[PDB]
């Protein structure tokens, strides 16, 4: 009577595709509600996009430099951007107004995100260190000197109480949020991108030489590697596609959207249609909508829809 769906591959295909900026795509992110996508541009430029339907909503601006990442606060309200003129910038996202510009990094701000609550901000830089922000004051809480190299990534898990960030320096560490310190070191290729896994127990780490492996950081083990994209220069994000199918999705360098099927590894849809570098994709959180973004011969972001 009620079992499980028969697994079957995805068929996301090409539904929109978003012009407008007018440099590089640097990220795309999902609000938590659903409703909007957020892109952040080298060209000092955030836009808002309709999740559902691509259409542009509004551009929101005031950096000096261009924006490597954007991230959405739980309630969908707020993003917090990371820059190269080396402040982060916390935004109401219906008035486009600025509320707190994140001073302190002494390079290039490469990463950022909200902690679930979004009383914190949490961030990294190319001046090799990770910082902890108070969203309501707008001052640095902490600042750890968390890597040797530019900080590619740094991600909250779910209750908040850890962060993992990422290297070129080749290491993934985890950190405690409340005292700063780290619990564990995981190790030598560049580490581009890592976050935590849905189920709280797993970072999934990209490195620089076309590999994603799924990892379980307390036990030190190596549960899941993917395969068969390019990646060997630029931090791609990866992502947990867990609406439907349980997909790994990831850009890169050969232009295609990459999904793999989470426990077989093998690469079950290749999206085409991008003509630069897929440098970002982000999964909605409810349905079964990617999005995409490209660099500078691109510069748009695609949005492609499943049935399931
Ligand atoms: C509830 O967790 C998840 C839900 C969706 C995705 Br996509 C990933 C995870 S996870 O946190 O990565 N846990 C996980 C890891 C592996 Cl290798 C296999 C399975 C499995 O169900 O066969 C699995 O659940």
């Known amino acids: ?58 551009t929101i601006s005031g950096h000096k430099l261009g924006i490597s990442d954007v991230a959405w606060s739980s309630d969908s309200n707020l993003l917090v951007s990371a820059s190269d003129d080396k402040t982060l910038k916390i935004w109401d996202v219906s008035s486009g107004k600025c509320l707190k510009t994140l001073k302190g990094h002494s390079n290039y701000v490469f990463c950022c995100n909200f902690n ?15 910082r902890i922000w108070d969203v309501k004051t707008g001052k640095c809480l902490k600042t750890l000197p968390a890597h040797s190299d530019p900080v590619s990534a740094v991600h909250f898990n779910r209750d908040g109480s850890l962060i993992v960030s990422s290297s070129y320096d080749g290491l993934c560490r985890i950190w405690d949020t409340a005292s700063g310190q780290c619990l564990k070191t995981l190790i030598n290729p560049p580490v581009s991108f890592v976050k935590f896994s849905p189920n709280g127990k797993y970072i999934l780490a990209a490195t620089l030489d076309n590999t994603l492996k799924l990892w ?33 999705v990831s850009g890169s360098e050969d232009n295609l959207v990459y999904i793999w099927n989470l426990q077989t590894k093998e690469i079950v849809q290749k999206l085409q249609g991008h003509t630069d570098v897929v440098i970002s994709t982000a999964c909605h959180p409810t349905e079964n909508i990617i999005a995409s973004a490209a660099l500078e011969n691109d510069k748009t972001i695609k949005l492609w829809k499943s049935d399931c």
């Open 216 to 248: 379980d950081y307390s036990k030190g083990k190596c549960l899941k590697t993917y395969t068969g994209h390019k990646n060997e220069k630029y931090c791609i994000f990866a992502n947990f596609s867990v609406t439907g199918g349980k997909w790994i």
């Open 1 to 58: 009577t009620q079992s499980k769906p028969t697994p079957v591959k995805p068929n996301y295909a090409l539904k929109f595709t978003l012009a407008g900026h007018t440099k590089a795509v640097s990220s795309v992110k999902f609000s938590p509600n659903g409703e909007w996508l957020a892109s952040s541009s080298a060209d000092k430029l955030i836009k808002i996009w309709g999740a559902y339907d691509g259409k542009f909503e509004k």
């Open 116 to 130: 679930p609550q979004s009383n914190l901000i949490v961030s990294g830089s190319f001046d090799e260190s990770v």
